[PDB]
Design brief:
part of a larger assembly, 4 chains, A alpha+beta (about 220), B alpha/beta (about 575), C alpha+beta (about 325), A: about 220 residues, alpha+beta, four-stranded antiparallel sheet, three-stranded antiparallel sheet, 13 strands, B: about 575 residues, alpha/beta, seven-stranded parallel sheet, 16 strands, DNA-binding, ATP-dep_Helicase_C (chain B), hydrolase activity, acting on acid anhydrides, in phosphorus-containing anhydrides (chain B), hydrolase (chain B), ATP-binding (chain B)
DNA sequence: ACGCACGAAGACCAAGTCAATGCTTAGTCTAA
């Protein structure tokens, strides 16, 4: 209904997404947040994450996706490998075990695995300006993005705060909405650049492995 | 909004939201460009505030205070509320000392004016005393108009020394920044003289707030004036002069030798000696009482001591005052008053008015920013010549020679009246000698006495005479003075300030101790953007009327051509202006 | 709900950065091969962009405390100060699954993966404590989103903001503290000192001979006690800002957060327990732009409802809720 | 539990700061290469944030005693004056490894890396001496949080609080 | 009497790196 460019500015570094970060997924998450604040936490999230101000592309086989390209990642600084751990305080647990707060009969903790496992994991942190292209209503998209505060992931530890955002109408020739996971039988003329065949979901949520389908994923964006 | 009849299109998108934020209790920051009709929109905001009941106060320098008075007088919805004046002592004359001075000089004009009652004679004062219906006497503006032969500061209301004195205590309040300074002094001292200002006002508007912070620093800083003080004591004071000057000069020499060459422990004996001796200190007692107040302000323990010999005169100097104005003083103003302010240099390129929020302490949630605006006729009708300076802007004579030659060829090429922006008296005096050889009488420069009291009027008269005059501004001319050919109501004449040249960026023009605190806290970034503010302020002299069509600009500093990293904001600022296609 | 906590650390804050980094005696980080090298444990630094030295943008490191560390500190404070005493008052006992879920959100109690009904989600996400910190076998989305402890520094202006410019520090805030470990046997000086040792002089002689032989063998080509090294810490006195947001908080959850903030001063930040690192004092707590920190802790007429709600929740809290949350 | 000990030193306190420093005869630290330089072992100073009357917070050095050094001092004092006399009263003997771990926290430079049993952890953390310091071949968290020795100075007012301002000293103490 | 404790065991190749920040110079008078 109108061609849009979505720009997001970060006040804190975000987790660099391993796979494509799609504008429609973020809009669906914000819509689910709105309907949660309006109805509560008992809602089914799958009943409100398609009520987005984005018009849909449908292929020959009926496979459909939102016209919202995956966010482009331009890094203002080199990616930083962030380290986080996980451990249960062994002395504190021993005290609780002595005092009957904990019902554990096992003699020793096992840092390699089990309840008292120490774990080490890493994820990259990047300073970037999030730009993506979509087809929809400017007013409604801007309203939805107004309540968005964090971008990407690891939001519980405060990664990817939004300093601001901008939604602008741009000519179609700039860059298309196609830079996303398009269905397998999508038309070649609407694809921008090379598209490698891979397994990914076409509708949000994109982490659900039961929804995963063979799809054309942009090579220059993964 | 009442009073919006004269509001121009540029001020329309901002005036309504600024007025709405007033009742919201939110402090807002706006940049009404010079020549966009600031006075009448300030008057409209004042009328809006007066309509809803709460008393109105407005802060402005005296000249623009008169200008705003001229704008607000025609507003009935502003006239509905009682309009009160400013009550500054130097805003009037002695007048008895002034009377005797005029009698001794046989200046019958001043004598007749004072014996008549010192009633208004100038247009601004007459309007402010008649249309506002405020009986006034002994105003210093009329004395200055009658004669420019009163450069001394002894022309000032004697503390022991009237219908205006009755009207001091007898809606809209007219005041400057320093009236607010005096009243915040009153609150901070007694709550924790001229008390006409209400102790709680729901609306204040400041047309020049970027300089309000330095005014508050000035009131909260007391200068010892030690070397001029002892010189004046030797020249005038005769009551036990020898031992008094012995003690004072011993103090001056000891502080100069130890510190220059009460926070500092070594200053404690000097402070004790000054307290013991300077109390020995006639009508000139105020000249010693100011130094006494400076001494006890230093003794107060809340002050920071800055001292150094003058780079030009080598006279020892001591500066004392509160550097901690950011905790209780401005926050007291915020609690007392919900207000708004306007200044052409509020929002920086990347600071987003943070410097404003910090200089003028505002609660983090109470402050609301506004989008920047600029008319097309403010940036387009001027081109910058690429004639850069080839030498570092030091005080070396060769640099002065080269700059003088460059500005001489500029003046020869100059279309009409021109302004050369000189930062300090040192550079001007070093520069005026070379110019006077060629320009001759065409060049006119400020002095310690020569200032905008009569020099701006003389320049305006000479420009109308076709002399193509050159005004070598020094500090004062950087801000406030008007260079718009108001009489030529095309308005596109672009001749009284057809061309203007900048001699330095400048760098570190502000010398307030609060600026030192800010640069210590934040680093060299703050002074660079403050100098950007100053450079933008200097460009404010270029235009003060709409529809200007063709002017020219020259930049003279090797630093802009040296590609040093820190002058990048200046490059960005001047990049907004198209260069001269030479 | 936004919580802004202004934290000034009395003692240096030491959050160890992963990696084997070296330093010389003079203080040069990663000295060249020419001079001697000693191991260094640097503070946790995050690469941030800032306008350093009048530059447009510079990626300079900023010593911070990781957000996960702050989250775990808040969880431990709640557990050890309000939750555990409340459960003990009822003589409640927790299984291993419930305890692991409560203290680290570890799904080891029921790693099968349990479905959660909508009513169960509504009831449990409203729990005063477990709702804030999701996890367990169910592994919900917690309502708590705590930011890292960014220092109020020149480089953190675009992360903290300009609201607290008055407390910023211009220069570097990192300092190197050198540690040393000495062999106690070499410090014996008389048979009275060696009386407590069972071997007496013979044991000390054998220990010293073994040390000398090991040192000679190592010089020619088992590690002794003697060790010299340093660790980098953030200097004491620097102010920090902690930003906490709770998404759709109930009264009980906000009351629990306020109680934890009341009791947070007794805990430490990051590491350094041996050297008493991380000690801090709360200076100001801001709730939705309103200052609430009184000199006697978080108090006021605008927070009595939260305290009453959390006290009521603590009165009726039982271990069965923890077991149900942990699917045990 | 918080313990605050107020200490006035009769004799000067000298804690060596690692690294080579030089001073001239006049007293100038790190003199220019033209003048004569002499080796100097400075007293250890830890950078601290100090506020002044101007309200600006700046990083200034402060001569202190390291927390580790005087933690070891406390450990040695306890062992020499309380623990070891008690052991010797009953003719109790410690092995060389036990003595080394009691006085330094470890019997060797290589930690075991094997977790301790819960009952052992509880018993050791209930020990009057071992509970305070912990350590051992298997890292045990001690109960003793010990801080460095901060002189009561204008620079340390932010650190040690304002309740000891009556004993502060203005000028340099080095 | 199913649940939990507790050792043995089985994959097993294996480098190159370890700074990220420096920067200048005197006008104001419009409250006691």
């Amino acid at each position: 209904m109108d061609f849009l460019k979505v720009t997001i500015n970060l006040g804190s570094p975000m987790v660099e997404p391993g796979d494509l970060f799609h504008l429609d997924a973020l809009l669906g998450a914000l819509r689910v947040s709105e309907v949660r604040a309006e109805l509560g936490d008992g809602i089914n999230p799958r009943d409100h994450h398609y009520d987005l101000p984005l018009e849909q592309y449908r292929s020959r086989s009926g496979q459909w996706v939102f016209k919202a390209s995956a966010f482009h990642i331009n890094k203002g600084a080199a990616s930083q490998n962030w380290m986080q751990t996980s451990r249960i305080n062994t002395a504190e647990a021993a005290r609780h075990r002595s005092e009957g707060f904990l019902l554990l009969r096992a003699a020793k903790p096992n840092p390699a695995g089990g309840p008292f496992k120490n774990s080490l994991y890493h994820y990259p942190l990047v300073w970037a300006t999030l730009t993506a292209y979509c087809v929809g209503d400017q007013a409604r998209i801007a309203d939805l993005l107004s309540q968005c505060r964090q971008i990407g992931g690891r939001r519980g530890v405060g990664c990817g705060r939004v300093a601001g955002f901008s939604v602008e109408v741009v000519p179609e020739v700039e860059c298309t909405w196609a830079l996303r996971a398009m269905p397998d039988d999508s038309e070649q003329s609407i694809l921008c650049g090379e598209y490698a065949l891979a397994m990914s979901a076409l509708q949000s949520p994109y982490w659900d492995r039961s929804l995963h389908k063979p799809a054309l994923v942009p090579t220059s964006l993964a | 909004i009442p009073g919006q009849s004269e509001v121009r299109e540029v001020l329309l998108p901002l005036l309504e939201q600024s007025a709405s934020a007033i009742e919201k209790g939110k402090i807002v920051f706006a940049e009404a460009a010079t020549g966009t009709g600031k006075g009448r929109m300030i008057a409209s905001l004042a009328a809006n505030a007066a309509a809803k009941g709460d008393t109105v106060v407005i802060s402005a320098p005296l000249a623009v205070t008169w200008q705003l008075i001229d704008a607000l007088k025609g507003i009935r919805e502003a006239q509905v509320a009682g309009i009160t004046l400013s009550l500054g002592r130097p805003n009037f004359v002695s007048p008895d000392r002034v009377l005797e001075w005029a009698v001794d000089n046989e200046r019958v004009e001043l004598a007749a004016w004072v014996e008549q009652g010192g009633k208004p004679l100038s247009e601004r004062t007459k309007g402010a005393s008649e249309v506002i219906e405020h009986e006034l006497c002994w105003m210093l503006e009329d004395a200055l108009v009658l004669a420019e032969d009163l450069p001394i500061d002894a022309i000032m209301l004697s503390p022991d020394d009237c219908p205006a004195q009755r009207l001091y205590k007898s809606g809209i309040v007219l005041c400057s920044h320093y009236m607010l300074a005096a009243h915040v002094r009153f609150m901070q001292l007694r709550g924790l003289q001229s008390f006409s200002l209400p102790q709680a006002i729901d609306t204040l508007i400041v047309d020049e707030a970027h300089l309000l912070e330095q005014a508050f620093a000035a009131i909260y800083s007391h200068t010892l004036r030690l070397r001029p003080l002892v010189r004046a004591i030797e020249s005038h004071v005769g009551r036990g002069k020898t031992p008094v000057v012995n003690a004072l000069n011993a103090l001056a020499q000891q502080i100069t030798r130890t510190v220059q060459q009460d926070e500092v422990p070594s200053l404690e004996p000097a402070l004790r000696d000054a307290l013991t001796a300077l109390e020995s200190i006639g009508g000139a007692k105020a000249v010693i009482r100011v130094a006494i107040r400076a001494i006890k302000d230093a003794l107060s323990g809340r002050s920071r001591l800055r001292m150094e010999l003058t780079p030009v005169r080598h006279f020892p100097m001591l500066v004392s005052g509160r550097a901690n104005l950011q905790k209780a003083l401005l926050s007291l103003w915020d609690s007392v008053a919900g207000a708004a302010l306007v200044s052409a240099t509020i929002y920086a390129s990347d600071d987003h008015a943070v410097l404003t929020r910090w200089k003028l302490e505002v609660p983090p949630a109470r402050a609301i920013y506004l989008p920047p605006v600029h008319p097309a006729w403010t940036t387009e009708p001027v081109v910058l010549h690429p004639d850069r300076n080839a030498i570092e802007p030091n005080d070396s004579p060769e640099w002065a020679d080269e700059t003088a030659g460059l500005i001489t060829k500029v003046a020869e090429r100059a279309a009409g009246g021109t302004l050369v922006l000189c930062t300090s008296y040192q550079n001007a005096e070093l520069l005026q000698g070379r110019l006077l050889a060629v320009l001759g009488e065409r060049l006119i420069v400020q002095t310690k006495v020569s200032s905008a009291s009569m020099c701006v009027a003389q320049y305006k008269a000479l420009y109308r005479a076709g002399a193509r005059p050159v005004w070598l501004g020094v500090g004062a001319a950087w801000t406030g003075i008007d260079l718009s050919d108001e009489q030529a109501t095309d308005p596109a004449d672009d001749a009284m300030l057809s061309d203007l040249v900048i001699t330095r960026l400048p760098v570190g023009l502000n010398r307030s101790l609060t600026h030192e605190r800010r640069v210590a806290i934040a680093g060299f970034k703050i002074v660079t953007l403050e100098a950007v503010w100053q450079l933008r302020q200097g460009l404010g002299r270029l235009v003060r009327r709409p529809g200007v069509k063709n002017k020219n600009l020259w930049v003279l500093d090797s630093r802009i051509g040296g590609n040093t990293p820190w002058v990048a904001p200046y490059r960005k600022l001047l990049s907004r202006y198209r260069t001269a296609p030479l | 709900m936004q919580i802004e906590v202004l934290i000034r650390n009395i003692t240096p804050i030491f959050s160890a950065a992963p990696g084997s980094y070296y330093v010389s005696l003079d203080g040069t980080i990663n000295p060249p091969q020419g001079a001697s090298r000693f191991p260094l444990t640097r503070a946790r630094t995050m690469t941030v962009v800032a306008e350093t030295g009048d530059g447009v943008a510079k990626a300079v490191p900023l010593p911070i405390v990781p957000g996960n560390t702050m989250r775990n500190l808040l969880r431990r404070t709640m557990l050890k100060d309000v939750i555990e005493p409340a459960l003990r008052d009822k003589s409640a006992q927790l299984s291993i699954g419930a305890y692991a879920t409560a203290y680290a959100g570890n799904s080891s109690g029921n790693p099968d993966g349990v479905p959660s009904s909508f009513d169960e989600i509504v009831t449990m996400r409203a729990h005063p404590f477990l709702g804030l910190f999701g996890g367990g076998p169910r592994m919900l989305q917690g309502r708590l989103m705590v930011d890292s402890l960014y220092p109020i520094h020149q480089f953190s202006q675009r992360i903290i903001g300009s609201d607290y410019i008055n407390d910023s520090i211009k220069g570097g805030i990192t300092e190197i503290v050198w540690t040393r470990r000495n062999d106690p046997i070499l410090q014996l000086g008389s048979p009275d000192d060696a009386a407590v040792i069972e071997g007496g002089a013979q044991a000390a002689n054998d220990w010293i001979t073994s040390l000398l032989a090991t040192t000679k063998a190592k010089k020619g080509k088992g590690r002794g006690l003697k060790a010299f090294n340093a660790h980098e810490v953030v200097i004491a006195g620097v102010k920090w800002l902690w930003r906490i947001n709770v998404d759709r908080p109930s009264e009980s959850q906000i009351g629990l957060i306020l109680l934890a903030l009341n009791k947070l001063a007794n805990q430490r930040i990051a590491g350094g327990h041996a050297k008493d690192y991380g000690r801090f004092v709360i200076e100001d707590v801001i709730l939705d732009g309103e200052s609430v920190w009184t000199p006697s802790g978080v108090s006021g007429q605008a927070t009595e409802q939260f305290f009453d709600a959390i006290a009521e929740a603590l009165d009726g809290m039982t271990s069965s809720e923890f077991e149900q949350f942990a699917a045990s």
